């Protein structure tokens, strides 16, 4: 009851859940010690946090922070430190423990000594393109973020199919404007315009035959996150697989 603490956990896409703990001197404790300190004419407190650490599991391992941290001391403040946990594909929820050491130094070198230790579970409170029909999956083997200029470049698809008939699909980019509140109308027009002529495929209408190298050239500068022009058509039972993957900046 001197510094209220909370922990926030987020799930990054790079298979590393990041959990950040936040500490803040609570206002009720602030006024509680503040009137008794201002009786002796003190305006700013001094809670010296000298040893803050987090532990892992039933065997105690000290996972470090993401940056440096000295031994600080301040009043009426808040500070947050972020550790990087490991992403779990199973349903084993990791339970961690944190500990601090607040030295509540009253003045003229007459200090008290306080320590605290919480322990809880680091929950989070709740791409590979796959089709809807068959076993056919898509994933770009080369890193989906890429930094290019407006020059010629290459990109690499990959197909994991049912081995019964691996062939009979075609790719094409469809360089035409999709046929569409004037402000939202023109915003959707600018999205559909810079999609339809931003990059151009240097081999479209292209029969596939488990790799498939397909080659572009990029014209217009900008970050094309989930570049969604190119559209792999499946010949038999005529449907379309969108490929919402890949993101190329062109600067």
């Amino acid at each position: 009851l001197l510094n209220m603490r909370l922990r926030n956990i987020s799930l990054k896409s790079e298979h590393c859940i990041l959990s950040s703990l936040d500490f803040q001197t609570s206002k009720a404790s602030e006024q509680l010690t503040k009137k008794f300190i201002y009786p002796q004419e003190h305006n700013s407190f001094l809670k010296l946090n000298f040893q803050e650490i987090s532990y892992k599991l039933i065997d105690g391992t000290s996972q470090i922070e993401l940056d440096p941290i000295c031994p600080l001391k301040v009043p009426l403040t808040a500070f947050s430190y972020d550790s990087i946990s490991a992403t779990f594909k199973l349903v084993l929820l990791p339970k961690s423990t944190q500990p601090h050491r607040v030295k509540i130094t009253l003045a003229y070198e007459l200090e008290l000594h306080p320590n605290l230790k919480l322990p809880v579970r680091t929950s989070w409170e709740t791409s590979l393109v796959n089709s809807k029909l068959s076993n056919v999956k898509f994933k770009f083997i080369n890193s989906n973020i890429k930094v290019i200029k407006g020059e010629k470049f290459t990109m690499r698809l990959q197909i994991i199919n049912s081995s019964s008939s691996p062939l009979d699909l075609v790719v094409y980019y469809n360089n035409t404007i999709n046929p569409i509140t004037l402000e939202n109308q023109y915003q959707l027009h600018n999205k559909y315009r810079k999609i339809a002529e931003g990059i151009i495929l240097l081999s479209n209408d292209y029969k596939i035959p488990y790799f498939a190298d397909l080659r572009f050239i990029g014209i217009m500068s900008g970050y094309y996150g989930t570049l969604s022009g190119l559209k792999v058509l499946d010949l038999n039972t005529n449907e379309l697989i969108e490929v919402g993957n890949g993101a190329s900046v062109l600067i």
């Binding site: 298979h15 892992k56 599991l57 065997d59 105690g60 391992t61 490991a86 083997i141 790799f211």
Partner: protein
């Protein structure tokens, strides 16, 4: 009742080129916490002893076969590059898969990594990771 103590201690299609992979995937290395290897691995370099088996398969093939070194062994596709180590994990070494001369008979691979943390005793349990790789026929005579 006689007790003891309790001591605490996916590839793709490849051509005939050489692919050097630096691996930093989700290696377990199931020690207690924050396992420092203290003698790190730089380059594992497999597909060497597969060639050192394949050239004696040629030589074994040269006379009639009477199981001198071909006696039911399917260890061509095993690729068991034993990674020996000394005394929360560490990133793996460079692969350098290096398929420049290898048969079409294999379509799979595995590995084995010796997890070691020895304190005046013998070695410990050992962890193994497989790798499925297919090969591309780039050229023939």
């Amino acid at each position: 009742s006689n007790p003891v103590e309790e001591e605490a201690e996916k590839m793709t299609r490849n051509s005939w080129m050489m692919l050097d992979g630096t691996k930093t995937d989700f290696h377990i290395t199931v020690r207690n916490k924050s396992l420092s290897c203290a003698i790190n691995h730089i380059k594992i370099i497999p597909m060497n002893n597969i060639e050192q088996m394949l050239k004696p398969d040629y030589w074994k093939k040269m006379p009639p076969d009477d199981l001198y070194i071909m006696e039911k062994q399917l260890d061509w596709l095993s690729k068991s590059c034993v990674r020996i180590i000394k005394l929360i994990t560490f990133d793996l070494e460079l692969d350098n898969t290096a398929v420049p001369f290898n048969f079409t008979g294999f379509d799979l691979l595995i590995e084995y990594g010796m997890s070691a943390t020895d304190e005046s005793c013998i070695y410990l349990k050992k962890l193994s990771i497989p790798y499925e790789v297919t090969l591309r026929r780039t050229i023939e005579v």
